[PDB]
């Protein structure tokens, strides 16, 4: 019954939360601690991993969603292409989240989404924004994301570094789009 | 005592099953309501969950944790990453088995622990076997291709399921070896 | 190869259909 | 006369205790084990059962309990739970087949438990005991085969001796049970399955050495020990 | 009583039906619950149980003294003749569980067809023990009583005997 929320926690919702705030001080995800309604602690912990996936989705969605605005002086044309391609992936990920059956068992939801969860968390860490606010460190670092030839080259060295792993198709697609300018 | 088992074996503790880093998963060992007979069965089941938690930890530690940033075979390496990639996919049928269990428990609201013991008893043997494969790599700081030999020498295991399971991993890692050979040659 | 020929008090004779494999292998190898 | 205090467990609980014992389980409140000898607990009483007959039947199950416990202990020892690269490769095949048999036996016990928990059908000790009778027939033969193949020499120092001895007590006991008759054809089929899935390693070593032409064994498993093969190829 | 007896007739003797080497399963006690004379009924009934322990012992030790493959086949047959004597002790308990008034005499009646198969198979077994008929002459002592005349034990010994021929038709089929 509560799992319906979790299905939509994969997307941004309010039942669980992504307070755009400092990790664990005001940044929050809805949780039941100590007294709870038919929710032993383990249930909250499983919800917490799904929450990790949720926070990564919301942050990455913001990062890519922020469009050029037609006056993007700080970033480059190639960064704008990068964000477009990333949004293409995000749309597909959202589609799978939708394609999840509404009626599904509590453990089965998380076990179904493990592979995509780790894939997405990796994709997040690939970008500074996703890497920042991991949950283990604050939003203070705010690591500078490369732009231009720096960005393109950084992507390609990461492609060499992570060529063989399961995650490589995503990098290839991003690079194909990014090179066009 | 039913659904909590599937949570813990999925690898997230509950109050009944205290995780301690030293003892892995561990029952509190003292509840007046349950008699000692079920406790031993629970511990036997918890061994598998302990191994699963240790596996998930090690995998998370050495795969995707960084964007390739001290590089050294024990610490890091393409081959180590390939081993982690193989390990999670070899552990996938355990995930599916627990899934089918939850479906059948949705079907029936009163199922003994012995039934769980049965349906999971095939992995009860495979997981300990893979444990030494990882353990030698950690202990000996095995470097580069030597992991390939390390798994190959346990490919002569006299357990057919263990043999096939490790064979999958060696196929994956031969992936990267063939790949590096695919540039220089 | 033992198991296929197995699948079609005759226990010693059951073993007697497993030695011609060694005989063939040696016959090809003596060659 | 002074009455003695007794736990007064329910007869239905007794079958559940027997079922988990017949599957791989320890530290059951019934059938307390002390030194690897599973023994009926000293004081158990039930409503529609006298102490002595209950002791007799429970001891009779516990005798089989000792067999299943010892086989489970052996399986545990050589499941990988525990030297550096010492795969025995024949003890592992034997325990693997033993494990398959124990899986099927555990399935039958699981069906009985499912029937016990949710129905009005009465399952009592006599019913279940005589229901498992075919399996109990298998277990005694299995105990004899194990108790000769692996426990003949308790110190069991050498390894080729152990391997050859196990293969030679299966090949012998199959002949022993081959001519008992066509009455059941159960024991011989069990023993033959054990033999096939215990000889698989030796014949894999054979076929490899046959065509690929390099003898390949560890723990000195095979009978033609290539002790002198290391330097002789130098002589020509 | 009606479960202690429906198990004492089986292998497990119990306190009521004390076992002894000279004579087996003779309850010998003055009980208020049982009627005074029911012990006599119980004695006649315990003859059947006593016999059952004796066969079970005999199958146990087989499958210097007696030995062979035929004692590993006659005993396998002696399991099968006793199988409808196990099922027919399960069914009694199933009926007794529900009906609360049913008395011992139904046990008597229901297990009265087993006071002809058992006593005249017991002479076969004591013959095979007192005279060391170890080899192929076991077929003789089974076929010599299989002529019989009492139909319950004429078909029982037939089930026993056919197994022995099942062994003899593979010993003398390997030979031929």
Cα maximum dimension of chain E: 67
Cβ pair C25:D211 closer than 8 A: yes
User: In E, which residues are within 8 Å of C10 by CB distance?
Assistant: 174
Measure in Å the smallest separation between the Cα of D3 and chain E Cα atoms.
Answer: 16
Instruction: Assess contact for B106 and A105: CB atoms under 8 A.
Output: yes
- Of B106, B104, B117, B114, nearest to B9 by C-alpha is B117
Residues in contact with D43: Cβ distance below 8 Å, sequence separation at least 6, in sequence order:
D4, D5, D6, D7
What experimental approach yielded this model?
cryo-EM
Distance of CA D195 to the CA centre of its chain: 14
Q: Is B93 part of the contact surface with chain A (CB cutoff 8 Å)?
A: no
Per-residue b or e along E52-85, where b marks 16 or more CB atoms closer than 10 Å to that residue's CB: bbebeebbeebbeeeebbbbbbbbbbbbebbeeb
Task: State phi, psi for D33 to the nearest 5 degrees.
Answer: -100, 145
Chains C and E form CB pairs within 8 A to the count of 5
> Chain C: residue nearest D197 by CA?
C3
HEC readout, chain A: CCHHHHHHHCCCCCCCCCCCCCCCCCCCCCCCCCCCCCCCHHHHHHHHHHHHHHHHHHHHHHHHHCCCCCCCCCCCHHHHHHHHHHHHHHHHHHHHHHHCCCCCCHHHHHHHHHHHHHHHHHHHHHCHHHHCCCCCCCCCCCCCCCCCHHHHHHHHHHHHHCCCCCCHHHHHHHHHHHHCC
Measure in Å the smallest separation between the Cα of A75 and chain B Cα atoms.
Answer: 22
In whole angstroms, how large is the CA radius of gyration of chain C?
A: 11
Cβ pair D210:C2 closer than 8 A: no
Cβ pair D180:E93 closer than 8 A: no
HEC readout, D197-235: HHHHHHHHHHHHHHHHCCCCCCCCCCCCCCCCHHHHCCC
Residues in contact with D11: Cβ distance below 8 Å, sequence separation at least 6, in sequence order:
D46, D47, D48, D49, D124, D125
The C-alpha atoms of residue D42 and residue D32 are separated, in whole angstroms, by: 9
Discontinuities in chain A (C→N > 2.5 Å), after residue: none
The C-alpha atoms of residue D22 and residue D30 are separated, in whole angstroms, by: 12
The C-alpha atoms of residue D132 and residue D57 are separated, in whole angstroms, by: 14
The C-alpha atoms of residue E84 and residue D34 are separated, in whole angstroms, by: 38
The DSSP symbol for D90 reads S
User: In B, which residues are within 8 Å of D114 by CB distance?
Assistant: 111-112, 115
Instruction: Assess contact for A107 and B99: CB atoms under 8 A.
Output: yes
Cβ pair C2:D203 closer than 8 A: yes
The C-alpha atoms of residue A178 and residue A78 are separated, in whole angstroms, by: 6
Instruction: Assess contact for D46 and D11: CB atoms under 8 A.
Output: yes
CA distances (Å), origin A87, targets A65, A80, A122, A158, D17: 7, 11, 16, 20, 59
User: In A, which residues are within 8 Å of B82 by CB distance?
Assistant: 164-165
User: In B, which residues are within 8 Å of D79 by CB distance?
Assistant: 124-125, 128-129
The DSSP symbol for B27 reads E
Helix, strand or coil for residue B55? helix
Instruction: Assess contact for B130 and B150: CB atoms under 8 A.
Output: no
**Cα angle A49-A53-A58, degrees, rounded to a multiple of 5:** 140
User: In A, which residues are within 8 Å of B14 by CB distance?
Assistant: 40-42
Q: Is E174 part of the contact surface with chain C (CB cutoff 8 Å)?
A: yes
Task: State phi, psi for B24 to the nearest 5 degrees.
Answer: 55, -135
> Chain C: residue nearest E171 by CA?
C9
HEC readout, B131-177: HHHHHHHHHHCCCCCHHHHHHHHHCCCCCHHHHHHHHHHHHHHHHHH
Cβ pair C29:D196 closer than 8 A: no
Burial of D188 (0-12, 13-18, 19+ CB in 10 A): buried
The C-alpha atoms of residue B44 and residue D23 are separated, in whole angstroms, by: 12
The DSSP symbol for B19 reads E
Q: What is the dihedral of CA D171, D177, D183, D185, to 10 degrees?
A: -20
Instruction: Assess contact for B139 and B131: CB atoms under 8 A.
Output: no
Q: What is the dihedral of CA E82, E88, E94, E99, to 10 degrees?
A: -140
Instruction: Assess contact for A170 and A89: CB atoms under 8 A.
Output: yes
- Of A23, A92, A31, nearest to A59 by C-alpha is A23
The DSSP symbol for B112 reads -
Measure in Å the smallest separation between the Cα of E108 and chain C Cα atoms.
Answer: 44
The C-alpha atoms of residue D8 and residue D11 are separated, in whole angstroms, by: 9
User: In B, which residues are within 8 Å of A105 by CB distance?
Assistant: 99, 102-103, 106
CA distances (Å), origin B73, targets B62, B144, B155, C16: 11, 6, 21, 52
Task: State phi, psi for B94 to the nearest 5 degrees.
Answer: -60, -45
Residues in contact with B125: Cβ distance below 8 Å, sequence separation at least 6, in sequence order:
B159, B161, B162, D79, D80, D99
- Of D153, D179, D185, nearest to D166 by C-alpha is D153
The C-alpha atoms of residue B58 and residue D57 are separated, in whole angstroms, by: 50
User: In E, which residues are within 8 Å of C9 by CB distance?
Assistant: 170-171, 173-174
Helix, strand or coil for residue B25? strand
Instruction: Assess contact for A17 and A51: CB atoms under 8 A.
Output: no
The C-alpha atoms of residue B118 and residue D55 are separated, in whole angstroms, by: 29
The C-alpha atoms of residue B180 and residue D213 are separated, in whole angstroms, by: 31
Q: Crossing angle for the helix pair B36-62 and D11-22, nearest 10 degrees?
A: 40
> Chain C: residue nearest D196 by CA?
C3
Touch between A and D (at least 3 CB pairs under 8 Å): no
Give the resolution in Å.
Answer: 3.7
Cβ pair B132:D80 closer than 8 A: yes
CA distances (Å), origin E49, targets A21, D211, D223, E18, E119: 83, 63, 53, 12, 11
Per-residue b or e along A99-125, where b marks 16 or more CB atoms closer than 10 Å to that residue's CB: eeeeeebbbbbbbbbeeebbbbbbbbb
The C-alpha atoms of residue E118 and residue E47 are separated, in whole angstroms, by: 9
The C-alpha atoms of residue D175 and residue D195 are separated, in whole angstroms, by: 12
HEC readout, E61-119: HCCCCCCCCCCCCHHHHHHHHHHHHHHHHHHHHHHHHHCCCCCHHHHHHHCCHHHCHHH
Helix, strand or coil for residue C7? coil
């Amino acid at each position: 019954e509560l799992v319906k929320d979790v299905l939509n926690v994969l997307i941004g919702v309010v039942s669980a939360t992504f307070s755009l705030c400092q990790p664990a001080q005001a940044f929050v995800v809805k949780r039941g601690v100590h007294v709870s309604g038919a929710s032993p602690e383990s249930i909250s912990s499983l919800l917490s991993e799904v929450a990790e996936y949720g926070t990564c989705y919301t942050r990455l969605s913001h990062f890519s969603l922020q469009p050029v605005l037609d006056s993007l002086y700080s970033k480059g044309l190639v960064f704008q292409a990068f964000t477009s391609g990333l949004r293409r992936y995000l749309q597909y990920y959202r589609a799978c989240v939708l394609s999840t059956p509404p009626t599904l068992s509590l453990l089965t939801i998380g076990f179904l989404f493990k592979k995509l969860g780790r894939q997405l968390r990796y994709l997040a860490e690939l970008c500074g924004v996703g890497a920042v606010l991991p949950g283990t460190c604050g939003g203070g670092p705010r690591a500078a994301f490369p732009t231009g030839v720096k960005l393109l080259s950084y992507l390609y060295q990461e492609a060499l570094h992570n060529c063989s792993n399961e995650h490589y198709p995503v990098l290839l697609s991003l690079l194909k789009t990014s090179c066009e300018p | 005592m039913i659904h909590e088992l599937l949570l813990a074996l999925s690898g997230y503790p509950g109050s009944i099953f205290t995780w301690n880093k030293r003892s892995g998963l561990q029952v509190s060992q003292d509840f007046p309501f349950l008699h000692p007979s079920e406790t031993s069965v629970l511990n036997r089941l918890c061994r598998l969950g302990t191994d699963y938690i240790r596996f998930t930890e090690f995998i998370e530690q050495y795969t995707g944790h960084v964007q390739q940033q001290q590089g050294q075979g024990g610490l890091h390496g393409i081959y180590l990453r390939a081993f982690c990639t193989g390990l999670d996919s070899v552990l996938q049928p355990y995930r599916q088995a627990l899934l089918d269990l939850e479906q059948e428990f949705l079907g029936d609201p009163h199922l003994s622990i012995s039934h769980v013991n049965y349906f999971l008893d095939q992995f009860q043997l495979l997981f300990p076997s893979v444990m030494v494969v990882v353990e030698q790599i950690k202990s000996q700081k095995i470097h580069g291709c030597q992991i390939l030999e390390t798994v190959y020498k346990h490919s002569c295991g006299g357990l057919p399921p263990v043999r096939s399971a490790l064979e999958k991993i060696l196929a994956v890692c031969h992936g990267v070896m063939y790949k590096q050979l695919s540039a220089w040659m | 190869v033992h198991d296929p020929l197995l699948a079609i008090t005759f226990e010693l004779t059951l073993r007697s259909c497993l030695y011609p494999h060694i005989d063939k292998q040696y016959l090809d190898c003596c060659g | 006369y002074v009455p003695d205090d007794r736990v007064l467990v329910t007869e239905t609980q007794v079958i559940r205790e027997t079922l988990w014992l017949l599957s791989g389980v320890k530290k059951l409140f019934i059938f307390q084990l002390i030194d690897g000898k599973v023994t009926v607990r000293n004081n158990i009483i039930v409503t529609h059962l006298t102490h002595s007959c209950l002791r007799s039947v429970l001891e009779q199950i516990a005798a089989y309990g000792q067999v299943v416990f010892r086989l489970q202990e052996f399986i545990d020892e050589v499941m990988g739970h525990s030297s550096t690269e010492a795969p025995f490769r024949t003890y592992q095949a034997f325990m693997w087949a033993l494990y398959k048999y124990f899986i099927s036996f555990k399935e039958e016990l699981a069906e009985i438990e499912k029937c016990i928990i949710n129905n009005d059908t009465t399952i009592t000790l006599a019913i279940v005991v005589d229901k498992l009778a075919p399996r109990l027939s298998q277990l005694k033969v299995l105990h004899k085969v194990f108790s000769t193949g692996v426990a003949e020499v308790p110190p069991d120092t050498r390894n080729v001796v152990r391997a050859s001895h196990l293969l030679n007590t299966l090949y012998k006991a199959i002949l022993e049970y081959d001519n008992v008759g066509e009455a059941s054809e159960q024991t011989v089929s069990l023993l033959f399955s054990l033999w096939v899935e215990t000889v698989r390693p030796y014949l894999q070593t054979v076929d490899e050495w046959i065509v690929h032409g390099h003898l390949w064994d560890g723990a000195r498993e095979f009978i033609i020990q290539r002790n002198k093969n290391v330097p002789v190829n130098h002589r020509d």
